[PDB]
């Protein structure tokens, strides 16, 4: 299941790294958590790889995975107001992000965050605009969408989901539990290589961190 480059470092539980390629059936990695996972398998193949680089001081973060790899991601659920005018009508547009699905090129169904709109004439007054906004504010416990999508089917996204679609990685902060922190970033098609998996157990979530501390599954 996470399918990355010859020599991508992985953070073990125990804290030290491994490659990618050393990683055994049995080991331990470093859960997203900083609790242990551990490996029951591992795919290897060869597939179209994608390189990950983060769009800013710090060293970018950088991972290369296969195209069908899952990218752990964030989108904020984000509501948008405009004011546009259509036929003479003014109206208020509330724009929100919502999870739906695309249909790719190739005919699969791909599960994502869009764009959807709904538009209140301003003569109404503001109140039916301003209550959608509060109930879509409110219709989850989260502010972000917490999803996933292979590397291949990023460009599917519009491009404001796109633009507001980040990663994470997971340093220690104060009180020793691990934090969470945003980055954003760009990925690039490459051609066929080599890769090597690794498939977690089902006792926990499948996400880990490689050694640059960024989650993975």
């Keep these: 299941s996470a399918c990355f480059a010859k020599g991508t470092n992985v953070l073990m539980a125990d804290g030290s790294i491994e490659c990618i390629e050393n990683i055994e059936v049995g080991n331990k990695v470093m859960g997203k958590d900083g609790r242990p996972r551990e490996v029951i398998k591992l795919p290897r193949g060869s597939e179209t790889m994608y390189s990950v680089v983060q769009k800013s001081m710090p ?3 950088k ?3 296969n195209a069908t790899h899952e990218l752990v991601v964030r989108t904020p659920r984000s509501v948008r107001r405009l004011s546009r005018t259509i036929k003479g009508v ?3 547009e509330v724009i929100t992000f919502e999870m739906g699905q695309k249909k790719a090129p190739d005919g699969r169904i791909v599960e994502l965050v869009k764009e959807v709109s709904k538009s209140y004439p301003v003569s109404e007054g503001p109140e039916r605009a301003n209550e959608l906004v509060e109930s879509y504010r409110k219709a989850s416990n989260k502010a972000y969408f917490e999803w996933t999508i292979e590397a291949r089917d990023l460009s599917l ?8 679609t980040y ?3 997971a340093p220690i902060g104060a009180a ?3 934090e969470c922190r ?3 970033f760009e990925l690039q098609e490459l051609k066929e290589d080599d890769y ?3 498939t977690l157990s089902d006792d926990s979530d499948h996400q880990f961190l490689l050694a640059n501390q960024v989650v993975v599954h």
């Design 59 to 61: 060293e970018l973060l």
């Design 63 to 65: 991972f290369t995975c």
């Design 90 to 92: 003014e109206y208020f």
């Design 157 to 164: 996204l519009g491009s404001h989901v796109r633009k507001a």
């Design 167 to 169: 990663q994470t990685y």
């Design 176 to 178: 020793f539990a691990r």
């Design 182 to 184: 945003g980055f954003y």
């Design 196 to 198: 090597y998996g690794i």
